[PDB]
Amino acid sequence: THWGYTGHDSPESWGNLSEEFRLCSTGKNQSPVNITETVSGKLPAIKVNYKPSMVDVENNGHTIQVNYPEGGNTLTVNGRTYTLKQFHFHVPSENQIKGRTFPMEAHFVHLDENKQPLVLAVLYEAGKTNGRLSSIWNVMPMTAGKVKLNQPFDASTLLPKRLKYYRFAGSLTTPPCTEGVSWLVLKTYDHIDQAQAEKFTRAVGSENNRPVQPLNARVVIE
Amino acid sequence: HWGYTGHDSPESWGNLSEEFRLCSTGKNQSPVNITETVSGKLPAIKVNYKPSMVDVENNGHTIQVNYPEGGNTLTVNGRTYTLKQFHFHVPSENQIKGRTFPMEAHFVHLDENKQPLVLAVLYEAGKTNGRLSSIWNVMPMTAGKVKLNQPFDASTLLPKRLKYYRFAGSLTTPPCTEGVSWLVLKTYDHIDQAQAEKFTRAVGSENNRPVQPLNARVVIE
Ligand SMILES: [Zn+2]
Ligand SMILES: [Zn+2]
């Protein structure tokens, strides 16, 4: 069913749209969340192996998504290898750190061999222009459609130096709100100019952040 | 052929057809005016309604939302009833201590053995009911059936607290069949004047049957 962020299709109503979106309102391990209290722990290191690839940018009406038709771009964590399937954006951010909403947030969606999803999240602070995002921003479809990127894109450039992260379990922030998703939110933020965030919104048609959900029985580790 | 006005009013139903004789001779007729009750430990209601493809119908006596497919159920005491349809009455048919409400909704269920169960929701005059808007928008003004294209979840029409009044009754329209389980929710929902009047206009008149004596029945709450 059609769903959105405004009108009668807003996040508060996703569960009433179709029986398949039921977990959006009944789930107890939903995303995004407001990270306030955390438990300090010895978290395992992240091994990222991204390479210049043949990707295609897409405007699906909900976000601007960069699709990877093939494998080869991976993330290894605690012995398990996850393959990057796609990455997209949210303006403003969905997850919050101590009540702070960020200008933008990127979600790098991965899937392991058993099809278990893992999302790596990057938060952006308001500031200097990001040239690393220009290659995608300049070809950004202003309307619903896909555009093949002529030059190979290297997602490695979109990741910080230090890969320390916050770890918790959650779900997809969009319908059907499937749970069983591991979330790794990077502690080191990147940046964007207020104008970059603005062009995004204009292309999508509205802010596309889902409101924060209750942590419930969950503990966030840092 | 029956109605609420003209020569075929509720008070005459039993006289207009041998098939409608129970409307005048029944001792366990609905609706009723709930005044005196017996406090008892009633079983909790388990409602399992979901977004479904339904059709809206103006049959000349009410505005009805039909469910051709199964999947929407109500469970009480291990028994499971499947929602067949829900309709409305303006003003309400049942009363609580002499009080008639602006509107009343009837959710008609049937179990494996075709035993009818009616869940009733009463509405007070208040703010605009936005959860009824979708149905109200496509509401056929003339006798006819229209298939609501977007899915409708009847759970949005029910309050969080499901306490209810329990008594046995009948259908409130001919042939006034008895053996009907009635569960009237204690918590009220709301509608505005416009919505109520809009309903009367499409149906063509007030469609509430006058209250019937309880006789040997007792209402439990
Ligand atoms: Zn996302
Ligand atoms: Zn009725």
XYZ file of C-alpha atoms and ligand atoms in Angstrom:
445
model
C 0.000 0.000 0.000
C 0.971 3.633 -0.474
C 2.616 5.177 2.588
C 4.292 8.457 3.439
C 5.455 10.930 6.043
C 2.638 13.475 5.733
C -1.136 13.478 5.384
C -3.159 10.345 6.063
C -0.204 8.083 5.226
C 2.034 9.360 8.057
C 4.086 6.933 10.263
C 1.358 6.863 12.941
C -0.908 5.119 10.432
C 1.390 2.625 8.663
C 0.077 -0.258 10.796
C -3.504 0.465 9.732
C -2.675 0.581 6.011
C -2.096 -3.145 5.474
C -1.897 -6.269 7.620
C 1.691 -6.738 6.436
C 2.717 -3.397 8.012
C 1.286 -4.535 11.364
C 4.694 -4.755 13.074
C 5.115 -1.001 12.547
C 2.685 -0.396 15.418
C 2.884 -3.610 17.457
C 6.656 -4.152 17.409
C 8.707 -3.772 20.595
C 12.111 -3.572 18.941
C 11.460 -0.764 16.440
C 13.778 1.822 14.889
C 14.785 4.648 14.983
C 15.567 5.521 18.604
C 16.926 8.317 20.756
C 20.276 7.108 22.133
C 20.574 8.511 25.670
C 21.661 5.855 28.158
C 24.229 3.286 27.039
C 26.270 0.448 28.490
C 30.025 0.689 27.893
C 31.240 -2.552 26.335
C 34.104 -4.207 24.468
C 32.573 -4.122 20.986
C 34.223 -5.965 18.062
C 35.954 -4.030 15.279
C 34.398 -3.382 11.877
C 36.209 -4.417 8.699
C 34.961 -2.547 5.636
C 35.897 -3.564 2.111
C 34.190 -1.225 -0.325
C 35.493 -0.608 -3.845
C 34.649 1.628 -6.842
C 31.526 -0.009 -8.285
C 28.949 0.325 -11.043
C 25.964 1.745 -9.138
C 22.709 3.426 -10.114
C 21.003 6.287 -8.278
C 17.259 6.083 -7.703
C 14.359 8.273 -6.574
C 11.654 5.938 -5.248
C 9.457 8.675 -3.802
C 10.563 7.915 -0.246
C 14.290 8.662 -0.520
C 17.304 8.885 -2.851
C 18.798 5.399 -2.990
C 22.083 4.155 -4.469
C 21.748 0.541 -5.640
C 24.484 -2.090 -5.948
C 23.460 -4.710 -8.571
C 26.462 -6.885 -7.661
C 28.348 -7.981 -4.559
C 31.950 -7.229 -3.653
C 31.305 -4.416 -1.167
C 31.381 -5.965 2.259
C 31.481 -5.327 5.979
C 32.839 -7.938 8.387
C 31.882 -7.943 12.048
C 32.568 -10.700 14.576
C 33.455 -13.229 11.883
C 30.355 -12.594 9.748
C 30.523 -10.981 6.294
C 27.683 -8.729 5.103
C 27.236 -7.541 1.512
C 26.188 -3.943 0.795
C 22.963 -3.998 -1.199
C 22.221 -0.275 -1.123
C 22.491 2.984 0.778
C 20.043 5.862 1.139
C 19.362 9.095 3.042
C 17.071 10.770 5.557
C 16.615 14.508 6.083
C 16.573 15.208 8.858
C 18.038 12.196 10.707
C 15.892 9.418 12.177
C 18.099 8.325 15.050
C 18.967 10.947 17.695
C 21.905 11.160 20.086
C 20.824 12.570 23.455
C 17.791 14.270 21.872
C 19.820 15.852 19.063
C 18.393 15.592 15.541
C 20.972 15.858 12.743
C 20.656 17.610 9.342
C 21.073 14.272 7.538
C 21.580 10.525 8.105
C 22.757 7.782 5.741
C 21.816 4.077 5.984
C 24.107 1.489 4.403
C 21.980 -1.631 4.126
C 23.768 -4.978 4.189
C 22.672 -8.628 4.020
C 24.610 -11.740 5.045
C 24.447 -15.199 3.471
C 21.377 -16.115 5.560
C 19.707 -12.861 4.471
C 20.065 -11.302 7.939
C 20.024 -7.475 7.584
C 22.533 -5.062 9.115
C 22.382 -1.261 8.842
C 25.449 0.949 9.246
C 24.373 4.524 10.036
C 26.257 7.777 9.455
C 25.066 11.080 10.947
C 25.915 14.444 9.348
C 26.585 17.726 11.186
C 25.697 21.070 9.576
C 28.821 22.623 8.094
C 31.172 22.711 5.114
C 29.993 21.333 1.762
C 30.561 17.625 1.148
C 32.330 17.085 -2.155
C 32.233 13.318 -1.722
C 28.440 13.445 -2.129
C 28.526 15.753 -5.192
C 28.858 12.847 -7.629
C 25.474 11.530 -6.424
C 23.811 14.867 -5.668
C 24.483 16.299 -9.163
C 22.637 13.455 -10.928
C 19.903 13.128 -8.293
C 16.559 12.372 -10.031
C 14.197 15.231 -9.134
C 11.285 12.897 -9.930
C 10.517 9.191 -9.368
C 13.029 7.273 -11.460
C 16.443 5.635 -11.739
C 19.619 7.058 -13.306
C 22.622 4.890 -14.179
C 25.834 6.391 -12.829
C 28.394 6.536 -15.643
C 31.448 6.570 -13.369
C 32.100 3.815 -10.766
C 31.315 4.886 -7.195
C 33.479 4.085 -4.161
C 31.361 4.079 -0.978
C 34.538 3.978 1.117
C 34.767 7.782 0.769
C 31.489 8.156 2.674
C 32.905 6.587 5.847
C 34.802 8.276 8.755
C 38.352 7.558 9.929
C 37.439 6.017 13.288
C 34.848 3.247 13.017
C 33.689 3.149 16.651
C 29.932 2.603 16.865
C 26.776 2.305 18.944
C 25.225 -1.154 18.787
C 21.635 -2.257 19.301
C 18.928 -4.358 17.699
C 15.999 -2.796 15.915
C 14.082 -2.809 12.663
C 13.707 -1.221 9.262
C 12.454 2.376 9.673
C 10.102 1.923 6.705
C 7.166 -0.465 6.133
C 6.857 -3.378 6.777
C 9.101 -2.412 9.751
C 10.734 -5.877 9.805
C 12.567 -6.631 13.047
C 15.727 -8.683 13.503
C 17.904 -5.895 12.107
C 21.244 -5.193 13.745
C 22.108 -1.510 13.959
C 25.552 0.014 14.043
C 25.520 3.816 14.325
C 28.916 5.436 13.820
C 30.124 7.797 16.528
C 32.130 10.016 14.172
C 29.863 12.367 12.225
C 30.416 13.699 8.713
C 29.044 16.973 7.282
C 26.924 18.652 4.618
C 25.932 22.186 3.648
C 22.384 23.282 4.478
C 21.903 23.520 0.698
C 22.712 19.847 0.077
C 20.083 18.780 2.614
C 17.673 21.215 0.931
C 18.126 19.819 -2.603
C 17.442 16.330 -1.156
C 14.130 17.433 0.397
C 13.115 19.111 -2.871
C 13.809 15.899 -4.812
C 11.913 13.682 -2.345
C 9.069 16.099 -1.660
C 9.113 16.059 2.140
C 11.158 15.324 5.238
C 11.470 11.544 5.464
C 12.352 10.722 9.060
C 10.271 8.296 11.117
C 9.712 9.416 14.727
C 11.835 7.802 17.452
C 10.516 4.589 19.000
C 10.669 3.349 22.625
C 13.788 1.327 23.523
C 11.758 -0.931 25.837
C 13.861 -3.936 26.940
C 16.799 -2.926 24.717
C 20.213 -1.775 25.809
C 22.446 0.267 23.509
C 26.137 -0.617 23.737
C 28.965 1.808 22.981
C -40.981 -4.107 2.380
C -40.567 -2.371 5.748
C -39.228 0.883 7.166
C -39.203 3.403 9.983
C -41.838 5.797 8.608
C -45.074 5.499 6.638
C -47.498 2.634 7.250
C -44.669 0.126 7.697
C -43.136 1.493 10.904
C -41.473 -0.609 13.662
C -44.694 -0.702 15.681
C -46.331 -2.440 12.695
C -43.535 -4.823 11.538
C -45.072 -7.998 12.932
C -48.346 -7.196 11.168
C -46.896 -6.686 7.692
C -45.703 -10.278 7.177
C -46.196 -13.713 8.742
C -42.403 -13.942 8.588
C -42.076 -10.839 10.815
C -44.402 -12.123 13.585
C -41.534 -12.361 16.101
C -41.129 -8.566 15.998
C -44.444 -8.325 17.873
C -44.577 -11.599 19.842
C -40.957 -11.955 20.962
C -40.084 -11.622 24.648
C -36.348 -11.292 24.089
C -36.355 -8.376 21.629
C -33.711 -5.700 20.973
C -32.946 -2.817 21.403
C -33.304 -2.144 25.114
C -32.883 0.677 27.620
C -30.156 -0.451 30.019
C -31.061 0.836 33.477
C -30.655 -1.848 36.141
C -27.738 -4.284 35.870
C -26.026 -7.132 37.709
C -22.311 -6.751 38.353
C -20.517 -9.924 37.283
C -17.147 -11.239 36.159
C -17.508 -11.180 32.378
C -14.871 -12.790 30.089
C -12.419 -10.476 28.273
C -13.039 -9.759 24.564
C -10.268 -10.583 22.086
C -10.678 -8.561 18.884
C -8.633 -9.383 15.791
C -9.584 -6.860 13.119
C -7.196 -5.948 10.294
C -6.966 -3.720 7.163
C -9.315 -5.332 4.647
C -10.943 -4.803 1.270
C -14.586 -3.967 1.915
C -17.574 -2.508 0.113
C -19.931 0.227 1.281
C -23.660 -0.173 0.731
C -26.806 1.932 1.044
C -29.621 -0.630 1.278
C -32.402 1.825 2.081
C -32.407 1.162 5.838
C -28.776 1.900 6.740
C -25.222 2.425 5.463
C -23.473 -0.949 5.579
C -19.811 -1.941 5.266
C -19.583 -5.531 3.992
C -16.772 -8.091 4.379
C -16.762 -10.707 1.577
C -13.560 -12.312 2.885
C -12.895 -13.804 6.311
C -10.047 -12.818 8.600
C -11.653 -10.342 10.996
C -12.627 -12.128 14.201
C -13.818 -11.571 17.750
C -13.137 -14.188 20.435
C -15.060 -14.520 23.692
C -14.853 -17.581 25.964
C -12.948 -19.716 23.478
C -15.602 -19.042 20.825
C -14.568 -17.268 17.619
C -16.932 -15.123 15.560
C -16.139 -13.757 12.103
C -17.102 -10.153 11.291
C -19.581 -10.155 8.405
C -20.517 -6.478 8.348
C -21.071 -3.353 10.380
C -23.688 -0.650 10.002
C -25.026 2.413 11.792
C -28.149 3.889 13.326
C -29.043 7.552 13.784
C -30.001 8.147 16.423
C -28.947 5.169 18.580
C -31.303 2.242 19.164
C -30.054 1.085 22.550
C -30.174 3.512 25.469
C -28.282 3.772 28.716
C -30.454 5.014 31.575
C -32.922 6.655 29.177
C -30.176 8.385 27.178
C -30.345 8.199 23.383
C -27.016 8.769 21.639
C -26.362 10.649 18.360
C -25.295 7.391 16.684
C -24.727 3.670 17.263
C -22.594 1.175 15.336
C -23.410 -2.539 15.098
C -20.674 -5.039 14.249
C -22.424 -8.273 13.178
C -20.526 -11.536 13.660
C -21.281 -15.200 13.015
C -19.569 -18.316 14.396
C -19.139 -21.760 12.789
C -22.733 -22.639 13.735
C -24.200 -19.369 12.404
C -24.919 -18.090 15.918
C -25.089 -14.257 15.689
C -23.120 -11.915 17.930
C -23.559 -8.136 17.833
C -20.937 -5.781 19.231
C -22.332 -2.262 19.748
C -20.518 1.090 19.936
C -22.303 4.255 21.097
C -21.271 7.742 19.957
C -21.465 11.048 21.830
C -21.694 14.449 20.144
C -18.175 15.829 19.883
C -15.311 16.535 17.500
C -15.222 15.279 13.911
C -14.619 11.538 13.693
C -11.705 11.268 11.286
C -11.656 7.472 11.417
C -15.115 7.419 9.806
C -14.167 9.939 7.093
C -13.123 7.357 4.477
C -16.498 5.595 4.634
C -18.408 8.869 4.902
C -16.709 10.216 1.761
C -17.773 7.374 -0.564
C -21.153 6.910 1.164
C -23.724 6.104 -1.576
C -26.517 8.699 -1.361
C -28.848 6.407 -3.297
C -29.414 2.654 -2.933
C -26.225 1.045 -4.195
C -22.945 -0.763 -3.570
C -19.515 0.861 -3.930
C -16.218 -0.953 -3.327
C -13.861 1.086 -1.155
C -10.552 0.839 -3.035
C -8.275 1.514 -0.066
C -8.172 -1.055 2.800
C -10.226 -0.357 5.927
C -9.185 -1.483 9.411
C -12.213 -1.682 11.709
C -9.908 -1.790 14.746
C -9.594 1.991 14.449
C -13.318 2.167 15.233
C -12.932 0.471 18.634
C -11.664 2.018 21.915
C -8.714 0.586 23.870
C -10.893 -0.484 26.820
C -13.311 -3.236 25.879
C -15.598 -3.451 28.950
C -19.178 -4.223 27.914
C -22.792 -4.843 28.892
C -23.988 -8.394 28.187
C -27.527 -9.575 27.461
C -29.423 -11.770 25.017
C -31.580 -10.221 22.337
C -32.688 -10.206 18.731
C -31.992 -8.473 15.456
C -33.406 -4.927 15.523
C -34.820 -5.274 11.990
C -37.262 -7.825 10.502
C -37.636 -10.707 10.924
C -36.412 -9.836 14.462
C -34.733 -13.221 14.926
C -33.851 -14.065 18.528
C -30.902 -15.995 19.926
C -28.639 -12.983 19.372
C -25.710 -12.254 21.687
C -25.422 -8.528 22.463
C -22.268 -6.883 23.730
C -22.558 -3.111 24.170
C -19.260 -1.339 24.841
C -19.235 0.944 27.892
C -16.739 3.456 26.488
C -18.224 5.798 23.873
C -16.695 7.133 20.663
C -17.717 10.451 19.028
C -19.113 12.211 15.950
C -20.239 15.724 15.021
C -23.653 17.037 13.938
C -22.683 17.174 10.251
C -21.642 13.507 10.095
C -24.859 12.404 11.827
C -27.009 14.561 9.522
C -25.071 13.392 6.475
C -26.021 9.796 7.401
C -29.722 10.657 7.762
C -29.726 12.324 4.342
C -28.307 9.305 2.492
C -30.555 6.789 4.284
C -33.565 9.066 4.019
C -34.770 8.961 7.637
C -33.944 8.123 11.241
C -33.449 4.355 11.433
C -33.796 3.477 15.116
C -36.219 0.863 16.444
C -37.877 1.852 19.753
C -36.646 0.123 22.919
C -38.231 -3.162 23.998
C -38.991 -4.395 27.540
C -36.290 -6.572 29.126
C -38.913 -8.958 30.583
C -37.099 -11.905 32.219
C -33.634 -10.803 31.090
C -30.893 -9.318 33.211
C -28.033 -7.213 31.853
C -24.590 -8.051 33.210
C -21.729 -5.551 33.341
Zn 16.805 4.378 6.044
Zn -28.284 -2.532 13.561
